[PDB]
Design an enzyme around this catalytic site. Structure first.
Site, PDB file in Angstrom:
ATOM      1  N   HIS A 184     -17.510   6.226 -24.516  1.00 48.50           N
ATOM      2  CA  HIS A 184     -18.794   6.404 -25.194  1.00 48.50           C
ATOM      3  C   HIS A 184     -18.683   7.661 -26.083  1.00 48.50           C
ATOM      4  O   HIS A 184     -18.950   7.627 -27.303  1.00 48.50           O
ATOM      5  CB  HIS A 184     -19.893   6.542 -24.138  1.00 48.50           C
ATOM      6  CG  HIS A 184     -21.252   6.864 -24.679  1.00 48.50           C
ATOM      7  ND1 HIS A 184     -21.815   6.196 -25.742  1.00 48.50           N
ATOM      8  CD2 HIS A 184     -22.188   7.744 -24.251  1.00 48.50           C
ATOM      9  CE1 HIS A 184     -23.029   6.666 -25.962  1.00 48.50           C
ATOM     10  NE2 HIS A 184     -23.277   7.615 -25.077  1.00 48.50           N
TER      11      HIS A 184
ATOM     12  N   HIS B 116     -21.559   5.255 -19.996  1.00 48.79           N
ATOM     13  CA  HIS B 116     -21.606   6.661 -20.383  1.00 48.79           C
ATOM     14  C   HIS B 116     -20.379   7.379 -19.875  1.00 48.79           C
ATOM     15  O   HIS B 116     -20.456   8.178 -18.939  1.00 48.79           O
ATOM     16  CB  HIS B 116     -22.852   7.325 -19.811  1.00 48.79           C
ATOM     17  CG  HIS B 116     -24.132   6.743 -20.318  1.00 48.79           C
ATOM     18  ND1 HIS B 116     -24.952   5.961 -19.539  1.00 48.79           N
ATOM     19  CD2 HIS B 116     -24.730   6.825 -21.530  1.00 48.79           C
ATOM     20  CE1 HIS B 116     -26.001   5.585 -20.247  1.00 48.79           C
ATOM     21  NE2 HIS B 116     -25.891   6.096 -21.459  1.00 48.79           N
TER      22      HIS B 116
ATOM     23  N   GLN C  21     -32.893  -7.167 -25.782  1.00 47.83           N
ATOM     24  CA  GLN C  21     -32.065  -6.684 -26.872  1.00 47.83           C
ATOM     25  C   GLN C  21     -32.772  -6.876 -28.207  1.00 47.83           C
ATOM     26  O   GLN C  21     -32.765  -5.980 -29.047  1.00 47.83           O
ATOM     27  CB  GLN C  21     -30.720  -7.391 -26.880  1.00 47.83           C
ATOM     28  CG  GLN C  21     -29.801  -6.952 -25.780  1.00 47.83           C
ATOM     29  CD  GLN C  21     -29.330  -5.532 -25.960  1.00 47.83           C
ATOM     30  OE1 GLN C  21     -28.589  -5.225 -26.894  1.00 47.83           O
ATOM     31  NE2 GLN C  21     -29.761  -4.648 -25.067  1.00 47.83           N
TER      32      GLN C  21
ATOM     33  N   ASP D 260     -25.352   7.814 -31.152  1.00 49.32           N
ATOM     34  CA  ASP D 260     -25.406   7.477 -29.724  1.00 49.32           C
ATOM     35  C   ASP D 260     -25.595   5.976 -29.532  1.00 49.32           C
ATOM     36  O   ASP D 260     -25.296   5.444 -28.462  1.00 49.32           O
ATOM     37  CB  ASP D 260     -26.500   8.277 -28.997  1.00 49.32           C
ATOM     38  CG  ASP D 260     -26.362   8.232 -27.473  1.00 49.32           C
ATOM     39  OD1 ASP D 260     -25.223   8.172 -26.961  1.00 49.32           O
ATOM     40  OD2 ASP D 260     -27.406   8.264 -26.778  1.00 49.32           O
TER      41      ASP D 260
ATOM     42  N   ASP E  36     -22.890  13.398 -23.216  1.00 48.60           N
ATOM     43  CA  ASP E  36     -23.189  12.680 -21.970  1.00 48.60           C
ATOM     44  C   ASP E  36     -22.360  13.202 -20.798  1.00 48.60           C
ATOM     45  O   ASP E  36     -22.298  12.561 -19.747  1.00 48.60           O
ATOM     46  CB  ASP E  36     -23.010  11.157 -22.128  1.00 48.60           C
ATOM     47  CG  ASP E  36     -24.247  10.459 -22.709  1.00 48.60           C
ATOM     48  OD1 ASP E  36     -25.391  10.737 -22.251  1.00 48.60           O
ATOM     49  OD2 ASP E  36     -24.055   9.608 -23.611  1.00 48.60           O
TER      50      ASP E  36
HETATM   51 MG   LIG Z   1     -27.173  10.549 -22.893  1.00 44.26          MG
HETATM   52 ZN   LIG Z   2     -25.199   8.801 -25.173  1.00 42.70          ZN
END
Ligand SMILES: [Mg+2]
Ligand SMILES: [Zn+2]
Length: 322
Positions: free
Chosen positions: A82, A78, A279, A227, A117
């Site tokens: 990202h 993050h 995953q 995201d 983020d």
């Molecule tokens: Mg976040």
């Molecule tokens: Zn994120």
């Protein structure tokens, strides 16, 4: 709070972009990784292309970006990378659905992605909640998302940073909401309910984009889609990023351990074997459905779904020794 120096944005206004990338940003699977230096410039390009040049105030935008940049931490996942990645998926969805969204929605959705983020620690909500940490008491639900937005606002409250000044107090307060709702939607807790509702809505034939509640819900899915987009990249990129996520998940579980708590499989670094089984769970449970509903709602996003399927196929392969 961390502000950008004088000559960072001035040299960034100097920034022009090579032709080869111009034609490749437009692609859903596009990976920004190879171009770190060029990242601030790319956002700007994406803004311009989608929102217009004369539209946004340039001195302000450049100050805004490098200050957003400097308030992303050096955590494995993050981070600044990202942010831009997520911003990029937005631009790709937007570009393929340009008119569906207004010129404010597009202004706000791109700025929100970049900021979604901000000041992340590499620690999850649940962590900060089951513990405290003041943030879980201040923002009781959607803890980190609420911080993320707040920080966005603080950054906007800086000298020469308020890119939204040139709007009407009507528009100004509208766009801060689009952002707030957007940044909040990236709390994956909400996503699950939001997709079923949307699933429901599309499936019955109820979905109506003129409906602000419907609208908000659609924008929500988009944010989830972006995201997560790293699951939509070509496999080697996708695999590399999972390392960074886990790097964080583990550092977290370790601190759970360090202070006498027993972390789930997913944050247990001694549990690296179960990852591919997790995953696969996550793709099937979360990602596949996410891009599925999104493709039904917005068909120019089917590529994102394919990429995700292909990546699921790869995960299946890791499980069976191949
Ligand atoms: Mg976040
Ligand atoms: Zn994120």
């Amino acid at each position: 709070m961390s502000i950008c120096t004088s000559e960072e944005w001035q040299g960034l206004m100097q920034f022009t972009l090579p032709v080869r990338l111009c034609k490749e940003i437009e692609l859903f699977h596009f990976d920004i990784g190879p171009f770190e230096n060029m990242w601030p410039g790319i956002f700007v390009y994406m803004v311009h292309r989608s929102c217009g040049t004369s539209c946004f105030e340039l001195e302000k935008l450049c100050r805004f970006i490098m200050s957003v940049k400097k308030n992303y931490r050096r955590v494995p996942y993050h981070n600044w990378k990202h942010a831009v990645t997520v911003a990029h998926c937005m631009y790709a969805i937007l570009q393929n659905n340009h008119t569906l969204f207004t010129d404010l929605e597009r202004k706000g959705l791109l700025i929100a992605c970049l900021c979604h983020d901000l000041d992340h620690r590499g620690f999850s909500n649940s962590y900060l909640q089951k513990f405290d940490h003041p943030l879980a008491a201040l923002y009781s639900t959607s803890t980190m998302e609420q911080h993320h937005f707040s920080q966005t606002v603080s950054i906007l409250q800086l000298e020469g940073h308020n890119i939204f000044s040139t709007l009407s107090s009507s528009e100004y307060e509208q766009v801060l909401e689009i952002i707030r709702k957007a940044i909040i939607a990236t709390d994956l807790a909400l996503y699950f309910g939001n997709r079923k509702q949307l699933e429901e809505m599309y499936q019955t034939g109820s979905l109506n984009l003129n409906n602000q509640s419907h609208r908000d819900r659609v924008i929500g899915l988009m944010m989830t889609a972006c995201d997560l987009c790293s699951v939509t990249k070509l496999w080697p990129v996708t695999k590399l990023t999972a390392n960074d996520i886990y790097a964080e998940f583990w550092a977290e579980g370790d601190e759970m351990k360090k202070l006498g708590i027993q972390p789930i499989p997913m944050m247990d670094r001694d549990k690296k074997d179960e990852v591919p089984q997790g995953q696969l769970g996550f793709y099937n449970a979360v990602a596949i459905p996410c891009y599925t509903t999104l493709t039904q709602i917005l068909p120019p996003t089917e590529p994102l779904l394919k990429a995700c399927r292909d990546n699921l196929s790869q995960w299946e392969k890791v499980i069976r020794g191949e």
